[PDB]
């Protein structure tokens, strides 16, 4: 029984999004898992369990509550598991609270990249009138800062987020929103995260920040559930040119926090609509240890 | 270069006040120590360094800033150091930004107790009028709940706290303070922490809670710089009987957080006043490891 401290969506130590990984977590109760996640203090800790109906079952806990699948924690978990079991190029099936998920492992020069297929892409009607203006004013921007001819709009591949497309000229790192205003807007529109992003001039690459004060996370460093839908939204609205039937976007997040990370978003396209979204990233293990106490 | 994860002021895993301990830290810069402290996410991480004017130097970092000294981190550090070096019953001097402090290490039953001698006890003029009323109201109490004829006041042995003496009848675990009100009080009085405490009937034994929302810590599990001054306060205001040489109080803190800890406070007495305050506790190492990355 070991604990691993992992920075996900980065190969640079102390960057990315940190997660704990514990295994084997078989015969740990729900309450012991919750206690260990509280103790480690990461946004999430993944606990790896044996499964007879899948390759592996993962349970995910914040310091206070069990959650369903989490992108960065899932990357961390499979990165650890690949490294410990010495996997090569493999497809793995994992179970969680949220059912079954397809995970891919790619090995290149003794390092690993983990891919996760997300749920079905979807969009809600664009936010207009007072709700739009209130979101823009919560970021202390004006309508001139928004990418022309594109909506502020809830997008999802499983956990919904508000897309806020910004012009390249906007200083996204200087953004300091009204957190209480965003929290109020989240209850009305029923969406707990806001995702302002911009596109690097000329490239299929982006820079975003994810603010979710309603749920108690002021800002998450690197968010698969924002970057995935963003890639889907980019196809849906024909914002980026693509050859073939795939859009590949390199999403950057976490720079203002001093926790830069990179998610590769691959979107398969059917009749110019997003069909499937896959997110990819690597990780770095800072340290790992056997527990010095009986659990 | 190793990292230890320690719960201080307890022998029970997952209780007490957790701290990180890193050593040797001699080839780390200030920036690296700060990043490590941020990464571990403990309220404090202690870094153990060679000293040229004492037995050991310690630097203390929260996730955001360097601090002069802290009790639970000091206990963690010397506990780890005692385990790693196989020390016996030793009295040593440590150096920090707070200066030179005397640390005692005691070995009983293959385990260790660490004592730290704090600074000189100090007591400011009692808080009265609107300020006293504001503090009581922010705890959702009334004047009937405060230990009769005793002041609410800033007291200190190194880092000041507001002493709030409650009747033993008050349900201290049920307190849920107006944190915005405490934050505004802290700014007016120039003190960031509030320490409601009560005395167990017939015993030299206390229960307390330390709230410090002004600095982004809603509640601290076990605070040496609150329990120390509390011990001194009890002598200064003639609250508990004693022989006249020493008063020993067993302080408890952290129960409502599910992070129960204990801190022994020893106060030497001269002319019916507190002269010298020592705090003591044990600790438990949850795990430790060499860093897997180059620092």
Swiss-Prot record, chains A, B:
Its EC number is 5.1.-.-. GO terms for molecular function: isomerase activity; protein homodimerization activity. It comes from the Bacteria. One of its GO terms (biological process) is biosynthetic process. The active site is at residue 44. The keyword Transport does not apply. Transmembrane segments: none annotated. This is Uncharacterized isomerase YddE. The gene is yddE.
